[PDB]
């Protein structure tokens, strides 16, 4: 299945965007791009993830920007995994 490879990539990639929106850089962003991958076991779909990134953003962006970013990234995530080959 591609679910999981694609999940890890989608989840990681959003972390790097959210990190840039925080004003992280370098390795702070890479560490953060593990955190967003580490919030998807307790609840399926996109529940406990969203509250994690939103609370971490502290109001730095509107939810409408944020959730759209995540949702749109599933396409990008799966580009990268066939483009990395």
**Cβ atoms within 10 Å, residue 32:** 21
DSSP-derived secondary structure for 15-73: HHHHHHHHT--HHHHHHHHHHGGGSSSSSSSSSHHHHHHHHHHTTSS-HHHHHHHHHHH
Question: What fold does the segment set 1-85 form as a domain?
Answer: Major Prion Protein (1.10.790)
Q: Rounded to whole angstroms, how far apart are CA atoms 39 and 37?
A: 6
Judged by DSSP in three states, 84 sits in: coil
By what technique were these coordinates determined? NMR
Give me the residue spans of the domains in the chain: 1-85
> Which two structure tokens, joined as six digits, stand for 65?
């920007």
């Amino acid at each position: 299945g591609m679910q999981f490879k694609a999940e890890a990539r989608r989840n990681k990639l959003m972390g790097l965007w959210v990190a840039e929106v925080l004003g992280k850089s370098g390795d702070e962003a890479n560490a953060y791009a593990a955190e967003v991958v580490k919030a998807d076991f307790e609840e399926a779909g996109h529940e406990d993830v969203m509250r994690k990134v939103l609370g971490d953003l502290d109001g730095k962006r509107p939810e409408a920007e944020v959730r759209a970013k995540y949702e749109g990234l599933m396409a990008v995530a799966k580009a990268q995994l066939m483009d990395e080959l």
